[PDB]
Design a protein around this ligand. Structure first.
Ligand SMILES: *[C@@H]1O[C@H](CO[C@@H]2O[C@@H](C)[C@@H](O)[C@@H](O)[C@@H]2O)[C@@H](O[C@@H]2O[C@H](CO)[C@@H](O[C@@H]3O[C@H](CO[C@H]4O[C@H](CO)[C@@H](O)[C@H](O)[C@@H]4O[C@@H]4O[C@H](CO)[C@@H](O)[C@H](O)[C@H]4NC(C)=O)[C@@H](O)[C@H](O[C@H]4O[C@H](CO)[C@@H](O)[C@H](O)[C@@H]4O[C@@H]4O[C@H](CO)[C@@H](O)[C@H](O)[C@H]4NC(C)=O)[C@@H]3O)[C@H](O)[C@H]2NC(C)=O)[C@H](O)[C@H]1NC(C)=O
Ligand SMILES: *[C@@H]1O[C@H](CO[C@@H]2O[C@@H](C)[C@@H](O)[C@@H](O)[C@@H]2O)[C@@H](O[C@@H]2O[C@H](CO)[C@@H](O[C@@H]3O[C@H](CO)[C@@H](O)[C@H](O[C@H]4O[C@H](CO)[C@@H](O)[C@H](O)[C@@H]4O)[C@@H]3O)[C@H](O)[C@H]2NC(C)=O)[C@H](O)[C@H]1NC(C)=O
Ligand SMILES: *[C@@H]1O[C@H](CO[C@@H]2O[C@@H](C)[C@@H](O)[C@@H](O)[C@@H]2O)[C@@H](O[C@@H]2O[C@H](CO)[C@@H](O[C@@H]3O[C@H](CO)[C@@H](O)[C@H](O)[C@@H]3O)[C@H](O)[C@H]2NC(C)=O)[C@H](O)[C@H]1NC(C)=O
Ligand SMILES: *[C@@H]1O[C@H](CO[C@@H]2O[C@@H](C)[C@@H](O)[C@@H](O)[C@@H]2O)[C@@H](O[C@@H]2O[C@H](CO)[C@@H](O)[C@H](O)[C@H]2NC(C)=O)[C@H](O)[C@H]1NC(C)=O
Ligand SMILES: *[C@@H]1O[C@H](CO)[C@@H](O)[C@H](O)[C@H]1NC(C)=O
Lengths: 201, 309
């Protein structure tokens, strides 16, 4: 007879450039009414039910049949997309719920020169920082060019990853000609950052 | 193969619409080369979705939509309410998004409000009072004050006029003549106009006007003492004599007090037949709820005849 919201959707949502943002809106006893997403800034419609209206392919409605959750998915968020998005139900008067999405740029960096030149036999020390992200990363990838690095793939590899300090130190002992290439540090909740290495002898 | 899609545009801005309350209104939005894109109607201030293509999203059963050749998209609102007035938006899901707006206005005939409007005023002469009249309607009604029976009204400058506009008829220093029935008129161009009857009652202490302060008469004949009182509320009129002794009803004395409209009394005292004991100064008195007043009449004797010696 009367729909109402869930109360546990986390009005404040913080996403990072790239990846994707989710705004979850749950409604109890929907009925024949419909749930819609709008952008308060310019009053632009986004989704109605499961169909998309916006013609900005980045916006998509997610709803599992019979569920109470209507999720607004924003692909490839950008800083301009920071604003208030309202969950709306077709009743009269309509019942709304104002979500506030805030996207931030989170970049990772590797201390030192972007391009390193070390003599064969000397060590490699790549310290990576992901200080911009709001939440500490849950994992940090180390890509040797394109394939994932594994401390066991080569002797003399020391990898210390600390989500407490948002750092990851990759240490390669006694460099060799084969060890050349762009090493990439890709944390979970942040952007990528690479450093190209060249050797001699 | 596939084909190229054209850029849909608004053929013209939304035309403003004024509609009578309780009737139907039609917001239309014309587009060109809509093609695969969709038109939407939204209430701006509430930011509520109303229609998309030919579907009415809102549960408001008074809302409907219909299109002609996918060019003219018309939203219908049944049983218009004053709530329905405001801005509406016509939105196309282009990239970027396009939108137009148009205003729907609801006209309502004027209606005078009991509470904020003066009832029956009762003010003492000399003080000030403001007759008030408040009405509702669309547009904002105009309030015109008129005195019943063509009696004019005087502004602060002393100029006399037949009507005064404004919800407040400020009367500084009320007077006897301001008492009467006043007409409040509310009009806004939306028939019918309405009016309310507001009475103004002015209290004042009695005022005696002696017709003749000196009166000579001969012995054995009759005499009539005349006074006229003006007082509201109504007053009691009686005659006294000398120190204030009330006149005796019996014997030579006879009285006749008659009201003559305008809240004035005509009080007459007839003495007959005159003797020395009935000559002297008399007083005509009138009193009401505010006080009393008197006028003195001196009745002296003049001889029947006089000889020049
Ligand atoms: C106590 O005192 C009061 C007050 O006395 C009066 O006031 C004081 C201050 C002094 O000036 C006094 O001199 C004065 O008399 C006495 O009350 C008065 O009593 C007399 C009679 O004794 C009445 O006279 C009659 O008046 C009517 C006309 O009345 C209208 O006009 C008056 C002014 O002209 C006005 O004052 C009245 O209020 C009334 O006003 C009219 O009202 C109508 C309706 O609202 C309105 O449409 C008019 O516009 C309005 N007019 C005005 C001017 O405002 C008059 O018609 C009577 O004459 C008939 O009777 C006479 C004989 O009695 C006769 O000679 C006439 O020809 C006429 O005869 C009639 O004719 C018709 C037509 O053909 C016929 O059909 C009838 O059959 C015929 N009738 C008869 C009997 O023949 C008469 O003159 C005063 O009106 C009255 N005043 C007040 C204020 O009450 C009171 O009597 C005293 N009591 C005691 C015990 O002493
Ligand atoms: C369509 O209708 C809307 C709404 O107006 C209402 O409906 C109409 C159908 C009609 O019945 C109106 O009587 C009724 O109110 C119109 O929107 C209004 O537009 C006017 C003019 O732009 C606005 O008035 C302005 O308000 C400003 C403050 O917000 C004020 O600063 C402006 O004053 C300036 O300009 C005037 C000249 O107009 C100048 O004299 C001043 O000195 C100053 O420079 C001006 O008063 C209203 O606020 C608008 N109403 C709303 C609700 O927004 C719309 O214009 C109309 N469109 C067409 C094409 O007719
Ligand atoms: C060493 O490698 C890094 C990236 O490491 C890997 O490279 C990819 C090919 C994959 O293997 C991934 O697993 C991983 O990123 C190079 O930096 C990155 O280079 C790529 C391609 O040159 C950049 O991609 C571009 O990204 C922009 C972003 O807008 C797109 O618009 C482009 O279309 C294109 O996809 C990527 O941005 C870049 N990363 C950065 C700059 O942080 C690195 O350049 C390489 N070494 C050298 C010397 O080039
Ligand atoms: C690997 O290098 C990191 C940082 O690289 C260096 O940092 C400066 C000290 C300077 O030498 C720069 O030119 C290099 O890019 C080392 O981490 C820092 O170490 C210093 C000294 O021990 C310390 O004061 C800082 O706090 C450290 N920073 C962080 C983020 O921990 C690290 O010790 C080196 N590891 C090895 C094994 O050589
Ligand atoms: C009426 O006049 C008196 C005397 O100046 C003043 O005290 C009072 O406020 C006035 N009231 C109104 C309604 O003007």
């Amino acid at each position: 007879s009367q729909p109402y919201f869930d109360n546990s959707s986390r009005r404040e949502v913080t996403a990072t450039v790239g990846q994707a943002a989710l705004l979850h809106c749950r409604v109890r006893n929907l009925g024949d009414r419909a749930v819609s997403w709008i952008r308060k800034r310019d009053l632009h419609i986004l989704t109605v039910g499961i169909l998309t209206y916006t013609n900005d392919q980045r916006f998509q409605s997610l709803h599992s049949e019979g569920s109470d959750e209507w999720t607004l998915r924003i692909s490839s968020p950008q800083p301009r997309d920071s604003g208030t998005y309202e969950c709306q139900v077709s009743t009269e008067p309509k019942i709304s719920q104002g979500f506030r999405l805030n996207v931030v740029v989170s970049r990772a960096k590797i201390l030192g020169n972007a391009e390193l030149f070390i003599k064969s036999g000397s060590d490699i020390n790549l310290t990576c920082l992901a200080m911009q992200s709001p939440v500490p990363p849950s994992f940090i990838y180390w890509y040797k060019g394109k394939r994932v690095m594994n401390y066991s793939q080569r002797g003399g590899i020391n990898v210390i990853t600390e989500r407490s300090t948002r750092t990851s130190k990759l240490l390669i002992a006694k460099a060799t000609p084969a060890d050349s290439g762009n090493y990439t540090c890709s944390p979970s909740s942040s952007d990528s950052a690479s450093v190209v290495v060249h050797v001699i002898n | 193969p596939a084909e190229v899609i054209v850029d849909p545009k608004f053929s013209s801005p939304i035309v403003n619409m004024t509609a009578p309350v309780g009737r139907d209104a039609f917001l239309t939005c014309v587009v060109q080369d809509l093609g695969p894109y969709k038109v939407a109607w939204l209430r701006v201030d509430t930011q509520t979705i109303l229609t998309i293509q030919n579907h009415v999203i809102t549960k408001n059963q008074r809302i409907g939509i219909a299109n002609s050749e996918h060019k003219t998209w018309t939203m219908r609102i049944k049983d218009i309410k004053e709530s329905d007035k405001g801005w509406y938006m016509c939105q196309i899901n282009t990239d970027p998004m396009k939108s137009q707006m148009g205003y729907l206005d609801v006209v309502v005939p004027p209606d005078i409000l009991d509470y904020p409007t003066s009832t029956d005023m009762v003010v003492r002469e000399g003080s000030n009072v403001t007759l008030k009249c408040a009405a509702t309607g669309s547009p904002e009604p105009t309030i015109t004050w008129r005195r019943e029976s063509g009696v004019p009204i005087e502004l602060a400058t002393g100029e006399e006029v037949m009507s005064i506009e404004g919800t407040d008829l400020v009367i500084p220093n009320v007077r006897r003549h301001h008492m009467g029935a006043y007409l409040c008129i509310a009009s806004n161009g939306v028939p019918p106009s309405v009016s309310k009857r507001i009475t103004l009652v002015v209290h004042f202490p009695p005022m005696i006007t002696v017709q003749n302060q000196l009166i000579g008469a001969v012995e054995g004949k009759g005499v009539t003492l005349d006074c006229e009182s003006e007082a509201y509320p109504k007053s009691i009129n009686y005659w006294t004599r000398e120190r204030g002794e009330i006149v005796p009803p019996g014997g030579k004395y006879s009285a006749n007090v008659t009201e003559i409209g305008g809240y004035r009394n005509s009080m007459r005292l007839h003495i007959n037949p005159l003797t020395q004991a009935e000559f002297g100064s008399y007083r005509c008195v009138a009193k009401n709820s505010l006080g009393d007043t008197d006028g003195t009449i001196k009745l002296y004797r003049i001889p029947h005849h006089h000889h020049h010696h």
